[PDB]
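Morning - CT2 inputs below, output right after.
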Amino acid sequence: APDSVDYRKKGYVTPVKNQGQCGSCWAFSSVGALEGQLKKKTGKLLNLSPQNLVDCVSENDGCGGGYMTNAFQYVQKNRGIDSEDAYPYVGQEESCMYNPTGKAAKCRGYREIPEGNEKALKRAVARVGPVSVAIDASLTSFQFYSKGVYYDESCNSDNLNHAVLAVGYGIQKGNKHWIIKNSWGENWGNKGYILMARNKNNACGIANLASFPKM
Ligand SMILES: *C(=O)[C@H](CCCC)NC(=O)OC1(Cc2ccccc2)CCCC1
């Protein structure tokens, strides 16, 4: 009886969002990780504010990209992150309008998964919850994905360019996989999700930049 986990059934995941014309993949990924830990610690979750991260995380580059660890760092220093409702996503960077009245979660730090270790990533997903990850999502085969377990050998593990959220893992038709929540709208892939090959030599670099927030 193989290990399997789907945090969507557990109430750790919010509906799929859409970055729009904004390289904010990392903000949705971070918010997604924070949301999982929120549910796990407080028993309930809310939609956190990715726009809050885009505008305030000065260490990152807004619509120009950013690292999830900088996001977590920010929330800890700032002593809070706004809810999606208090700081709505507009799809482009603007001045930092963080307001403590709309706080919906806190962060006390973060941990990175040892680079390249899918086993460690598997344990983290199982012991912590949804984990922020990065991959190479530039391949056409990746972008037009619709079902099954994605695997394309050309995927370059040394070219991480898109941040996502690992909300679980398991196996389909004999092929092990990671359950990945994207931020290109539910119109993308399978209702916004995509199953990516797991234990297939770290395909797409799925484990080269994984981390989660301590809450
Ligand atoms: C996801 O929307 C962004 C898109 C960036 C627009 C150019 N991807 C991203 O943030 O990539 C990471 C950070 C980064 C950005 C640019 C060059 C190098 C690194 C890399 C993996 C996760 C975020």
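Note: Residues 144 and 189 are 7 Å apart (CA to CA).

O.
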